[PDB]
Amino acid sequence: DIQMTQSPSSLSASVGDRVTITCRASDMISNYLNWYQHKPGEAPKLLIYSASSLQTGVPSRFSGSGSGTDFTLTINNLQPEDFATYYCQQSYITRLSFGGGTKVEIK
Amino acid sequence: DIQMTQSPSSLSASVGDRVTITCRASDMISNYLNWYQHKPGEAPKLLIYSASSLQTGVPSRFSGSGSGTDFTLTINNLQPEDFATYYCQQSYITRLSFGGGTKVEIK
Amino acid sequence: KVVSTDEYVARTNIYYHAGTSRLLAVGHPYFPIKKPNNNKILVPKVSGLQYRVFRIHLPDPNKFGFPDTSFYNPDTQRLVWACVGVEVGRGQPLGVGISGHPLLNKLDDTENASAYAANAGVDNRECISMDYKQTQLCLIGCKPPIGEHWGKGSPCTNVAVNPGDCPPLELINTVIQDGDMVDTGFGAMDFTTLQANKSEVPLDICTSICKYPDYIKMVSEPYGDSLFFYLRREQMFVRHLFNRAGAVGDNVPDDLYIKGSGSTANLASSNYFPTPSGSMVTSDAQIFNKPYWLQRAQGHNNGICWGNQLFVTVVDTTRSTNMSLCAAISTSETTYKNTNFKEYLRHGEEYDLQFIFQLCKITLTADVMTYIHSMNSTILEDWPLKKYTFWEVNLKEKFSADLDQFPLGRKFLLQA
Amino acid sequence: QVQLVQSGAEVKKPGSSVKVSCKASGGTFNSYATGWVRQAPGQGLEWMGVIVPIFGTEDYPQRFQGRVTITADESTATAYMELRSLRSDDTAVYYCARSRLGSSSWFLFEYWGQGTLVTVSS
Amino acid sequence: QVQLVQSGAEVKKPGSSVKVSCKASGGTFNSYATGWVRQAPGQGLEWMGVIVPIFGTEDYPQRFQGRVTITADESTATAYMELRSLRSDDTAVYYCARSRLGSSSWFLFEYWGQGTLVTVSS
């Protein structure tokens, strides 16, 4: 299988800031990376697939970029509804796996 | 066959506003959606076909977008001649069907 | 114990000639044409890959009017016909016909590939045509032929059956009738019951049964009444190699491959099927328009037509050209439009048959009576096939003793 | 340009059959696909059937099969719609929609008739 | 639109087996790929297995092979997950993720269940 590392594990931000989360793969996985958002009491929700494409109904303030072993998620103009937990997921092989998770909090 | 749901069923607007109408399909129909305009005492008139394309002779203030099961019609800078009834139509199969219809009125 | 007919049947030196004038059949090569409101057929289905079964009726020689009678004693003799020569005349030019499906289940071309199919769709069906395998065959007998095919069986009741399971398979023997379908390169199976998507074989066999003659069972019959003579000739090769689309019924074992990644994360279809092709029609390879002499049959029956009845089975795919017809809706236009013309397909087929018969007589002693009664009870009573369809031929009014007045009689007199 | 002209208003009794025509007048049409729509008093639009003589297509909704027949004549460029076993809920306005050969799809119904009123009552 | 509904909370003893269901209610689904996820108290998300009935794919993680079975029924559009030999560390919330045919990839898990709580204790 493939192990994935997500950084950082926790960060604090204020409304209107820019937040970046880095994701690193143990092998070359091309662009087979997806980003998920999870809030307490709800199901996980997909934001970015194939490391660049934006899911329908998602604000354009979310973006993602990367390839090979390095990927990143960017959120511009943070809003009060953006405070959640974010996860990587590789889909290079049929034995999928998740990252550690990054929790965004209020400064 | 395929059932289609159109929302809302009635709305009131003023001259110069933006009006959006949502249309939902019971199955995946790709981009096989068309929008029709109907006024009392006249025949129905086509505006948008294939969910994105604009019919010749139609003002550019009309637009449409969507895919899969969700589609939408947008009208910007509403004029006095835009007050009519609007219908969805799927053409994914040869057994075509219409939506419920949305009536735009004067505030 | 079964004895040969040469022991208890005596042959005389009287010969007769019989023949049909001309048989024609015109129709649609794929499906019948029927009225929308009614269910009566307007245009039948006539194809080059249909079994042609002719059931031929002969006069009763006991009641037949012979110029001379002293050659036999009606008090203790009975008469019967024997076949000694057959010719099947076959008109029309040589040709090859093709068939296909507008929604045939084809996924990819696997003969040569450069990219991997990593995404599945909803409907991947295509409009595909091909030409079938080449086959000629003729069978002659006094009983209708026997064919075999693959069909569904009765499952065991120990465990329940879920939707989508593989149907059980068994081999079924039936009687070949006029209008049945011959094998085309996909096997001898019931396509109606063993295939549910209706999109795996072309339009003229997708709801039919393809049958193959049961030669082994026919030649092993103790009396040998169902086959006096037979000829066969068939050939085919492979033109295209494709996949099929659908859900995977049986998974490939994990010890036959190494798993991939990226585009090859999942596996492509392993339900490969080929496209058949008959090669080429020539005049030198034809088995028709030639006389057959029935000197000595393989079985114990040596051409005796019990019950005044004959059966001839013919298959010939070497003349299967379909004609295209066009009709103009409006002729008041000087520029071509696709919507101003209508297209139709037709197939026509021509036949001729001619026979030489010999008169035989049988002495009815107690042992002979017992043997014939054990062989067939209806023969003594005369001195069943009502639920089958054959092409009926009535030769009760076409015999002549002037043997040299006909093309086949001249050859018969020339060979002897 | 081209204009589609429909027949006049019809008054029928229950149990009878009605037939409506739709003729193209200007220019040369060379029709592509034909379909019929209706509107009942106080209701929306209902598709009633389509024929595409090329590709050999003829399809009607399930609630209308057996009572609706749609025909086209290319020599005179005239479409016909047949309703059998009329009921009191068939009182409505009927519209003829047609598509022209040379367009990008068979469902570009850019040509519409003026509509015909049919009243089924005793 | 379409909503996935899961079964109720489960309380099991160690050594037993549990089975969880996931039914699609609205519209017609025609599923593409099915997978199961879980979250333990105070931990992250763990993938537990995927099946793709087209292409004939069925794959589970190494730490879960032999105890997890994932099944799908297309007639009723219902997914099932089976756990055998339950342990005290299997107390968690389980989520059903599904993809629909007609999308651009098999890993577009846009449909999720509400989650089912499973408690393994004596």
- The encoded tokens of residue D121 equal 């009552």
- Subunit partners of chain E (3 or more CB pairs within 8 A): A, B, C
Residues C86, C91, C94, C100: what is their CA dihedral angle, to the nearest 10 degrees? Answer: -100
E122 CB burial (10 A radius; 0-12, 13-18, 19+): exposed
Asked if E100 has any chain B CB less than 8 Å from its own CB, the reply is: yes
Tell me which residues of chain C, numbers 151 to 190, contact chain E at a CB-CB cutoff of 8 Å: 163
A97 → closest Cβ in E47, E57, E108: E47
Nearest CA in chain C to A32: C262
C-alpha torsion sign, points C82, C87, C88, C89: negative
Q: In what order do the strands lie in the sheet containing D18-24?
A: D4-6, D18-24, D78-83, D68-73
**3-state secondary structure (DSSP) of residue B82:** helix
| Residue partners of C115: CB distance under 8 A and separation at least 6 | none
How many residues are recorded in chain B?
107
- The encoded tokens of residue C299 equal 């079985």
CA distance C291 to C276: 32
CA distance C82 to C358: 5
Residue B11 DSSP symbol: E
Give the count of beta carbons closer than 10 Å to the beta carbon of residue C153. 12
Q: State the Cα angle at B96 between D83 and D70, rounded to 5°.
A: 30
**3-state secondary structure (DSSP) of residue D55:** helix
Residue E103 DSSP symbol: S
CA distance B96 to A89: 41
**3-state secondary structure (DSSP) of residue E64:** helix
Q: Tally DSSP H helices, then E strands, for chain D.
A: 0, 11
- Whether the Cβ atoms of residue C278 and residue C235 lie closer than 8 Å to each other: yes
- Subunit partners of chain A (3 or more CB pairs within 8 A): B, C, E
| Per-residue CA distances from C263 to A31, C114, C121, C260, D6 (Å) | 12, 12, 16, 8, 57
Q: Which residues of B38-62 are buried (b: 16+ CB within 10 A; e: fewer)?
A: beeeebbebbbbbbeeeeeeeeeeb
CA distance E109 to E33: 8
- Whether the Cβ atoms of residue C107 and residue C121 lie closer than 8 Å to each other: no
Please name every residue paired with C126 in a beta bridge, in sequence order, or none if there are none. Answer: C104
Residues in A whose CB is inside 8 Å of some CB of E read 1, 32, 34, 36, 38, 43-46, 49-50, 55, 87, 89, 91, 94-101
List the determination method. cryo-EM
CA distance D14 to D89: 10
Please answer yes or no on whether B30 and E100 come within 8 Å at the CB atom: no
CA distance C31 to C10: 50
Closest to D94 measured CA to CA, from D108, D72, D79, D106: D79
Task: For tokens 């059956």, name the residue.
Answer: C161
Q: State the Cα angle at B6 between E78 and B37, rounded to 5°.
A: 145
To the nearest whole angstrom, how far is the Cα of E75 from the nearest Cα of chain A? 25
Give the count of beta carbons closer than 10 Å to the beta carbon of residue C351. 21
For chain B, first and last CA: distance in Å? 37
**D34: region left, alpha or beta (phi > 0 left; psi from -120 to 50 alpha):** beta
Closest to D56 measured CA to CA, from D75, D79, D39, D72: D72
Please answer yes or no on whether A43 and E44 come within 8 Å at the CB atom: no
C-alpha neighbours within 13 Å on the C-beta side of residue C137: 22
Task: For tokens 């609706």, name the residue.
Answer: D68
- Whether the Cβ atoms of residue D104 and residue B91 lie closer than 8 Å to each other: no
**Looking at beta carbons, which residues of chain C come within 8 Å of E57?**
266-267
| Per-residue CA distances from B48 to B36, B76, B98, C320, D107 (Å) | 7, 15, 14, 50, 12
| Residue partners of C291: CB distance under 8 A and separation at least 6 | C85, C86, C87, C408, C411, C412
Resolution of this entry, Å:
2.9
- Subunit partners of chain C (3 or more CB pairs within 8 A): A, D, E
- Whether the Cβ atoms of residue D95 and residue D38 lie closer than 8 Å to each other: yes
- The encoded tokens of residue C176 equal 């070949």
CA distance C53 to C315: 9
Residues in B whose CB is inside 8 Å of some CB of A read 67-68, 70
CA distance A74 to A61: 8
**Looking at beta carbons, which residues of chain D come within 8 Å of C344?**
none
Q: CA C234 from chain center: how many Å?
A: 13
- The encoded tokens of residue C131 equal 């030409």
Q: For strands B53-54 and B10-13, give the pairing.
A: unpaired
Asked if C340 has any chain D CB less than 8 Å from its own CB, the reply is: yes
C-alpha torsion sign, points C166, C168, C169, C172: negative
For chain A, first and last CA: distance in Å? 37
A95 → closest Cβ in E59, E97, E110: E59
CA distance C109 to C128: 12
- Whether the Cβ atoms of residue A97 and residue A104 lie closer than 8 Å to each other: no
Q: For strands C229-235 and C134-141, give the pairing.
A: antiparallel
Query: What is the 3-state secondary structure of chain C?
Result: CCCCHHHHCEEEEEEEEEECCCEEEEEECCCCEECCCCCCEEECECCCCECEEEEEECCCCCCCCCCCCCCCCCCCEEEEEEEEEEEEEECCCCECCEEEEEEECCCCECCCCCCCCCCCCCCCCEEEEEECCEEEEEEEECCCCEEEEEEECCCCCCCCCCCCCCCCEEEEEEECCCCCEECCCCCCEEHHHHCCCCCCCCCCCCCCEEEEECHHHHHCCCCCCCCCEEEEEEECEEEEEECCCCCCCCCCCCCCCCCCCHHHCCCCCCCCEEEEECCCCCHHHCCCCCCEECCCCCCCCCCECCCCEEEEEEEECCECCCEEEEEECCCCCCCCCHHHEEEEEEEEEEEEEEEEEEEEEEECCHHHHHHHHHHCHHHHHHCCCCCCCCEEEECCCCCECCHHHCHHHHHHHHHC
Please name every residue paired with D83 in a beta bridge, in sequence order, or none if there are none. Answer: D18, D68
Please answer yes or no on whether A32 and C259 come within 8 Å at the CB atom: no
Nearest CA in chain D to B94: D59
CA distance C85 to D40: 77
CA distance C325 to A94: 55
- The encoded tokens of residue B38 equal 């109907």
Question: What are the DSSP calls for chain A, one per residue?
Answer: ---EEEE-SEEEE-TT--EEEEEEESS--TT-EEEEEE-TTS--EEEEETTTEE-TT--TTEEEEEETTEEEEEE-S--GGG-SEEEEEE-SSSS-EE---EEEEE-
CA distance C55 to C391: 6
C-alpha torsion sign, points C248, C152, C129, D31: negative
Give the count of beta carbons closer than 10 Å to the beta carbon of residue C53. 22
CA distance C87 to C91: 13
Please answer yes or no on whether D105 and B96 come within 8 Å at the CB atom: no
CA distance C43 to C348: 12
CB pairs under 8 A between C and D: 16
Please name every residue paired with A54 in a beta bridge, in sequence order, or none if there are none. Answer: A48
Closest to A9 measured CA to CA, from A78, A105, A106, A76: A105
Task: For tokens 């057929």, name the residue.
Answer: C41
Please answer yes or no on whether D101 and C337 come within 8 Å at the CB atom: yes
